[PDB]
């Protein structure tokens, strides 16, 4: 039977950043990039 308890590890309350707790990132699809030299 193992006992789990909690001390030390992360005890921070106010952070001093932009803290969004969302995974952030736009759907493009479609990027620019035309390069064509000579064979393609
Ligand atoms: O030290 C770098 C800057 O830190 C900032 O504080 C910080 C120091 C550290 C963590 C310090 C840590 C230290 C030693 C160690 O062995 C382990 C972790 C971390 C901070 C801020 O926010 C992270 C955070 C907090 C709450 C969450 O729910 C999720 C992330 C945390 C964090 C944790 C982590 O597992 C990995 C990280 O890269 C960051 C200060 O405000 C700045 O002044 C300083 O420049
Ligand atoms: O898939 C990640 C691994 O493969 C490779 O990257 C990649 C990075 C990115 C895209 C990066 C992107 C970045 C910024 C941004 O604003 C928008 C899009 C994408 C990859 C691979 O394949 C996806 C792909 C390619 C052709 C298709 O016909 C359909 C999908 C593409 C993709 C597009 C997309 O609209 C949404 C996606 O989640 C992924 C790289 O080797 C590494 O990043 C990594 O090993």
Do not use: C, P, T, W
């Amino acid at each position: 039977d193992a006992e789990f308890r909690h001390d030390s590890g992360y005890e921070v309350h106010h952070q001093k950043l932009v803290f969004f707790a969302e995974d952030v990132g736009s759907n493009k699809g479609a990027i620019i990039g035309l390069m064509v030299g000579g064979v393609v």
